[PDB]
Structure 1
Amino acid sequence: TNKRGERRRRRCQVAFSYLPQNDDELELKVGDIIEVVGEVEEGWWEGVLNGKTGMFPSNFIKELSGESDELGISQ
């Protein structure tokens, strides 16, 4: 639950296909950068991609979560 990070909108990079749209989610096609909610979904994020908003279980998307070598590095 690294909400202490960049807060609100935090940017993560997505891997290959976040396909997950049922109602109104984002699709991260091969390698998109998101700025979602960050760690607010602890291990999961919620955010927007190129204006397409959604949320993922960081499944296809790995990156972010409070930087300054605190991306899980020194906690």
Structure 2
Amino acid sequence: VRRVKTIYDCQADNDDELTFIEGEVIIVTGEEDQEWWIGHIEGQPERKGVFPVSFVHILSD
């Protein structure tokens, strides 16, 4: 369960996609593709789904 710190805003359109803005913490809970991981907003785990990796700043926390 690695953590990522969104450095770009991602305005999802599908409910499978995750919606977040710059500064959101996401806990990586799975992986789909190189640019597409599965995870949840830290502090609000009900916000989860797929999120673009090129939009987040990964911490090996």
Does the C-alpha gap of structure 1 residues 21 and 48 become closer, same or farther in structure 2, counting only changes over 3 Å? farther
Percent identity of the aligned residues? 35
The count of corresponding residues between Structure 1 and Structure 2 is 57
- List alignment gaps of at least 5 residues for structure 1: 1-8, 69-75
RMSD: 2.4
**TM-score normalised to the size of structure 1?**
0.56
- List alignment gaps of at least 5 residues for structure 2: none
**TM-score normalised to the size of structure 2?**
0.64
- Could you say which structure has the higher strand fraction? 2
Note if contact 1:17-1:60 (Cα within 8 Å) is conserved in structure 2: yes
